[model samples]
Every structure is written in structure tokens, then in C-alpha cells.
Target: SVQTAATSWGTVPSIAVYTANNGKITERCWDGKGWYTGAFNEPGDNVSVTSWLVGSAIHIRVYASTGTTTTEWCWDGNGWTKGAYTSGDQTAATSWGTVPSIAVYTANNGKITERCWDGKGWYTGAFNEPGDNVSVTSWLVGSAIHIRVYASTGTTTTEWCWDGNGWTKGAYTGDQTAATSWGTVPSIAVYTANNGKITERCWDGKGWYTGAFNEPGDNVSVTSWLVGSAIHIRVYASTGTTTTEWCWDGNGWTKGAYT
Candidate 1:
């Protein structure tokens, strides 16, 4: 669980990816001013990531869980691209500006499927959002393309979108550590089942809100990123040793970095 964005705070950087590290995954980057290095790839019951930027060449994507054998590892800071299988699962990425998008829940049929990158690969898009243990998140607002579906079980939420034209959905829709945006709307940091007490969920444009400003407790695991203007959250608790850092800069919450 790791995430970031910015310019004078450290020069825009914040990214980290993993699920339960079920099978395997790794990504290292942080720009509060340090740590730009790093992977043991290929292994996934679940994993997720998404990054953005174009002209300066900085983009990262990793969606393990091999949906249909779906795999994609990317980083355009220059290197890191040897992971590219095209199926879909533990993968939920978002982008519309520089052309990069992914949404999955289909090991054969979990509905909620989306693919976007073009120039000769990855295109299918009509609409989908059925259900399963359900969970997915996406962003991009001015032209439309906002997806959301949640299920860690309070059971309720689905406010899908695709406004350039087709695809639609509506619900008060609420839900995650897997959603973040400085792009306008969307914010998540959730856990309330087995690793109980760690809350947050916001979308403010109209609906979807819970546990407002902050709350960081329990056996941790949370991720958030929105670099430049600042919206960073990383509250992790992997075990009894190593991996410690809890930083959220919208108002409070301190403590700093490590791998």
C-alpha cells in the first residue's frame, strides 16, 4: 500500500503497489524528496496501481492477478516494461488524458470490465458492472469517465460513468484504499472487516462521503496519491517488523518514509 504527486515539495513523486503480496509485486518511488529505485514480479491473487503524466515522461502501471493471465508492468521514467500480459483481475487503473485505462473483475465473468489504451492494443468498452466480492475505482472528470463499485460488504455502491457518450450508472454510490484523485473528485482509505478500523471515503461533487477528514488506526494498510497540490496518504502496517510510515498532508497526520 503506497501512493503520491507535486513540484517544490520534492519534485512530484509517490507510488507503491501490492495487494497481500499474495504471489508477487513491487514498485519503489517517493518524492517528498527521496527513494527512487527498484521488483519481484509475476504472482497475484490481487494487486493494483495507476499513474499519470505525459510530457515529462513519468507513468506507472501494475495490475497483477493475471486476469485471463492479465499482467501489465509499466514505468516511463525510462525503464521497466517487461510485464505485459493482457487478461484482467486485481487490476484497476485510470487515465484518459495520456491514454491509459484499466478496470477489471473478470476471471471469466465478474462483470466490471474496461480497457482503454489504443494504437493497436487494448480497446474493448461497452459497459459492465455485475458483482462478486466487488471492488473497483477509477477517475477523470471533465470529459467523463468515473467508475466506482464497492463490496467489502456493507453491500452497496456503483456510480459508473463514461460520458464522452455510452456507458452509464447511478447510485448514491459510496466506497477504499484503492481510489484517489486530485483531479476533482474521489478519495478512499478503507478497512473494516478483518483488519478493522481504518476509515475514509469521499467524492464531494454531490454524494459519497464517510468519516470525513481523517482517522488512522488499527492494523494499518491504506494508500492515496495526488502529488502536486498535495493529497498524500500512506498508513501501512504489514506486520510486527519493518514497513512503517504514515503520512497524509491535506491537514494533519505525520510520520515519514521507508521501504
Candidate 2:
């Protein structure tokens, strides 16, 4: 086990990384400090280890084996116990003693599945693509995280952001052939606060919009503050056919035809 410091408390940020037990690569960090060593557990085909500055509790899961016969254990900042299993077939945590912590997904050909215990339930997701790599990046702005995911299936990449609402998934439409430039240039911001009203915008080759509707009281402040650009404005219409739409450069605001 090794110890190091990436940043200070209040100023320091959370970290995220994926570790593969297929080799003796030790551990890796996405905070630019590069990869390092850690007390990782090894047992079967493949396993993944991840950590973050979320409260104090930790979550873990395992995957990449045939049938529900895999096992896993997590160190809850104190003692280690048999983790929980979710999805596939084991709906309950008693079917298999200590939960099959890890499982292999057949539909995905031969990909390994991973899960995490969020204190209340098990979160399931997949990892490792045929011809792609996993990358992670974090921001110093109050636990702000930015993720650029790559998939070998097609040109669809996923971009995630956690402003005030945990971590929500957003669709990034672009080509993945460039590799480095595989994320959408969406610049999200908060316009009106303290009123439960939040707005997000993106650089859709146009100015920022409400992302849906643009009625009388619906207006978002553009960061770049540029006019006559292919912009989109989204607002809550509640009742209207062409409520939210895209406002292009001098093209005026059109209904849901912002695409």
C-alpha cells in the first residue's frame, strides 16, 4: 500500500479511475499524478477498482465470469465484507451467498459487468470495449466531474456532468474516429438560482438556449454573448405544439426543429 497527496481538502477534488487485474499494472489515477500502487484484490478473470470523495462510505462490484459463481469483498473504510450482486438473474441478495459480486454478460459477447453498492442499492454498468479505451477527468470546481466515454459500436459518445444534481447522463453526438475530440462542446451554466429553476446550454454550432422552450419569461444568458449565431432556446411550455425550438443566426426561433 502506498500513500500520496493530490490536493488539499477544500481546494482538492474527487478522483476516478478504472483498474484492470489482467496484468500487474498496479493502480492508476486520473488526477494527472499518473498511475500508482494500491492494495487490490485479485481472484478470477477480470476485476475493477474505483474510489471517489463521496461522503465517507465506499461501494464496489465485480464482473467478467460465466454463470453466477463469482465472489467479491469491499473494505468499507474499516472492515471487509462480502459485497452484493444485482441484475442478470440474481434479483435477491440471498440466492447466492455473499452475492455473485461479478458476472459475465452473454449478450455483450464476452464483456465483464461491474456493480456498486450505493448504500441503498446496487448500480450496474459495463466496461472495456473491443477497440477503445476508458478515460476520466475531474474539475476543481466543487466536485465537478467530466467524463468522455468511447464505444466501439458507433459514433455515439457519452458526456457526464454533476453540477448540483448528482451525475446525470447526457448524449454527445459526434464522430469517435478523432479519438481525442469525441465529446460534445456543451457549456452548461446556472442562470437563475434560489428559485429551483436551473438551465443548461450547449455549443450546438449556435448560441445557448433553454434546450427546449423559449416563451415570454424564458431566456438564458449566453456566456460567449454572441448574436446572430445558430442558437437554440428551450423553455417550459406545458401546453403548446412548437413550444421549445432552436434559434439560428438571424433565422429567428423555430419550434422543436432545432436539430
Candidate 3:
């Protein structure tokens, strides 16, 4: 890890990568001064990890294998600590410095589910989308988090979002392939019928901005993140043999490298 200076919050921004190597989870972090290593007791193959920065602490969530068994752990400047446990393999998760992060996943019965942490403990329930695949993003508005999910069944898609208080369900659409967020706003993308281009709609803090941009690709997967002050959206596409990346900043969109 690089010795980068701390952010305005008095803690140096750091990243940790975790992997399930032969059924054990291991991780390394650059804790401002030097690198440190830690291992989690959770055991399973295909372990997937996600994290959130809460003040100066880094909270991590891990999921593994068929049952989608999950575990939570956190770093509090000195050492690692374990938190709660929840079932279901997460398809997506997001947080905004809250005590417990939020996550979404597909249940065994092919239904969408949401699990939320409310400082003291965990609460979970069915989130109402009846699909096998789900994608999600969260917008942290100060202390409130808004989460959105796009559930798909290979032929149709439906959208839903949590406005801190309740869920708002969206209409069904054809070819709605993937979804992500630009901070708290939601963006949904669809493959245009009879063509291989991506048409997207962005929630611009007010009404929905339909068809904001179109990028060329098929079998598209979209994700977005905050880069400096601009929001960068990446669209990745593959044809089982070739792959391409397309990007969009606040200014406009650009085609990126192919592999």
C-alpha cells in the first residue's frame, strides 16, 4: 500500500483486498503507517468481499458458496473484530457511514431480499422482486441511505428503490439488463430491441432523465463510482470471446480499451 495522506476526516484512506484461498479468508491492509495482515475464521470457497468506510473504520462483509452464508468484520484502528451473521449470498451492497450496511440478494426461492443493519442488530425481509438475478446501488444522503435494485428474469426487468422510509417500485421494462448509481441517483440500462446498444435512464435528483446516453454493446453490465468530484460510469460488455469497456463522466461518454 502507498503512504497516502489522510483525508479530511483525520484517517488515511486505505484499501484492503480479501480472498478465499483454499477455503480460508485472508487480507492485507496499509494502515497508514505500515502494512498489516489478518485472517477471518469463515471458511468456504468462492468467498466474495465488500467493504464500507465508517468514519475511520473499515467494515467488511464476506459471502461464500451455495447457501450464500455471510459474515461481517470490522477494523477499528487497532485490530480486527467480528460482527453479525446473515444468510443469503449478496448480489450487491452499499453504505453511507451508518452503523450497519445494507445489502440485497436473491433468495433460494428466486425472490429478491434486503437486509439492513440498524446500529444494534440486523433486520431482513423479502424485498418484493420475483427474479433470480438482482443488482443494487445505494446513495448516502447525509445519514440517510437510498437503495435501488433492478431485478431481472432474462426477459423482463423491474426496478425498486428505498427512499430511507419506504420502497418505490418501478414499471416493468423490456431488456433492462443492469443498474448502478451516481451517488444517490439511480441509473438503469437496457439493450435496445433488435440492436446491440445500451440505452440508459438516470435519476437526476428530480424526475427521471430517460435515455441520457447510449453506448454500443451487448450483454452489458454497468457500474459507477465517485472519482474525485465527477461520477464515472463504466459499461462492460462481452461476447464470450471479446470484451469492451465504455465510460461516461459528467461531461460526456467515451469508449475505453478493449480486451
If ranked by TM-score, best first, what sequence of candidates would result?
3, 2, 1
Ranking by lDDT: 3, 1, 2
Per model, state how many residue pairs clash.
8, 11, 0
Query: Which candidate ranks first by lDDT, i.e. highest?
Result: 3
Extract clashing residue pairs from model 3: none
Better of 1 and 2 by lDDT: 1
Q: Which portions of model 2 show Cα errors greater than 4 Å?
A: 1-18, 21-25, 28-36, 44-73, 79-81, 88-107, 110-171, 174-259
lDDT by residue (tens digit), candidate 1, 34-57: 755454355665555556666766
Residue range 1-259, candidate 3, lDDT tens digits: 1000011112233434344444555554443465466455555443334466665555566544435655555555555566564653324445556455556354345676766665656777557667765666666667777766777665566677677667778653424355655543444343231146667766655665666566554445554556555666655554433445565667676775422
Report the Cα lDDT for residue 117, model 3.
Answer: 63
lDDT of 2 by residue, 55-107 (tens): 54444332322234444545446644565644411111101112222222211
Residue 8, candidate 2: alpha-carbon lDDT: 13
